[PDB]
Structure 1
Amino acid sequence: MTEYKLVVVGAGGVGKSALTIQLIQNHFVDEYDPTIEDSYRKQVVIDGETCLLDILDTAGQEEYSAMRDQYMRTGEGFLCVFAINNTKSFEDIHHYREQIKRVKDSEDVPMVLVGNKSDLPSRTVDTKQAQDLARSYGIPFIETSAKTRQRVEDAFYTLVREIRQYRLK
């Protein structure tokens, strides 16, 4: 059994909680209190390995937060989520990456870029632009829908794979 500590970050409203609850509890939440921050543990099998996922669904995204610094220290991989209909949330991604890099004092940070709400038809962020951003960071890019469950397991499992690989570098 191997443990993987995953942290879900992104602007308020992008779907951090809805993604996390979909993965863990297999249901979509319509109106989840934006202040609730918890961790969830679940065992899954990924590439033949029985993995214990320990996932923190973050609430506040404050720059100045001792607790955020501690969880970025403890977290091994980061799911950086924006919503495909919220350009500001996409622009916020750089700031979250910078924060994480600073806390780690490293460029070796396992991260996956997630464009959530792929079920919404009025896109404001071109998939091309998001692919380009992820390429510039050297990270995977996945579009998900918490509402339909599209690529929910793939996003989290892709982050596990990124961590597993960095452990060999």
Structure 2
Amino acid sequence: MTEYKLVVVGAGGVGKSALTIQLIQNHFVDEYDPTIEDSYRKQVVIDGETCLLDILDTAGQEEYSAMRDQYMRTGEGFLCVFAINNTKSFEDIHQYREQIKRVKDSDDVPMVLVGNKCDAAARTVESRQAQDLARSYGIPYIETSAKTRQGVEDAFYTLVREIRQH
């Protein structure tokens, strides 16, 4: 069956792991354990196609991010995650998009911009600001909450749909 290799990137603490774990394992991780490099694999049906998702959950903390570039190299599509209550994480997206361009040696890489923690109280990134960033890159913007599961399937399956357009 078809395999889609997805990679989740973004700053430390934005919820990359919680998003991935909510998708794959259907629960919310409340604690914060920084990731080095973890992978998940699950068979799903997306738009009628039975396929395998192979998801690489990467480090956002610089301390844990050593060989991240090498892990990312085989990714077919990337979630670029920030948190809507973390302006710096949004400002950092540019760096992740550049890193993706370097590891894929392409300026045409399937990507989705994800504004996570949309359940949070202290929003500092307004939807329109993120829509504009995504528009600049030619990619969709989706908001998610790993806590409530809002948007989580939509985000990952949208990334698959973006891969399928390349």
Percent same amino acid at aligned positions? 93
- The runs of 5 or more residues in structure 1 that have no matched partner are none
Distance 1:37 1:29, change over 3 A: same
Q: Separation in 2 of the partners of 1:131 and 1:5?
A: 25
Which secondary structure state, in structure 1, belongs to the residue aligned with residue 64 of structure 2?
coil
Conservation of the 8 A alpha-carbon contact between 2:22 and 2:152: yes
Q: Separation in 2 of the partners of 1:149 and 1:47?
A: 19
Output the aligned Cα RMSD: 1.7
Please, what TM-score do these two structures have when normalized by structure 2? 0.95
Q: Separation in 2 of the partners of 1:32 and 1:98?
A: 26
Please, what TM-score do these two structures have when normalized by structure 1? 0.93
Q: Separation in 2 of the partners of 1:61 and 1:121?
A: 24
State the shift of 1:70 in Å: 1.5
- The runs of 5 or more residues in structure 2 that have no matched partner are none
Q: Separation in 2 of the partners of 1:55 and 1:62?
A: 20
Distance 1:93 1:127, change over 3 A: same
Conservation of the 8 A alpha-carbon contact between 2:9 and 2:60: no
Q: Deviations over 1:8-59 (max 9, x none)?
A: 1111110001001000100001113113431000011111111100001112
Conservation of the 8 A alpha-carbon contact between 2:7 and 2:57: yes
Question: Aligned residue pairs: how many?
Answer: 166
State the shift of 1:63 in Å: 10
State the shift of 1:61 in Å: 5.1
Conservation of the 8 A alpha-carbon contact between 2:36 and 2:64: no
Distance 1:70 1:109, change over 3 A: same
Deviates further, 67-76 or 147-156: 67-76
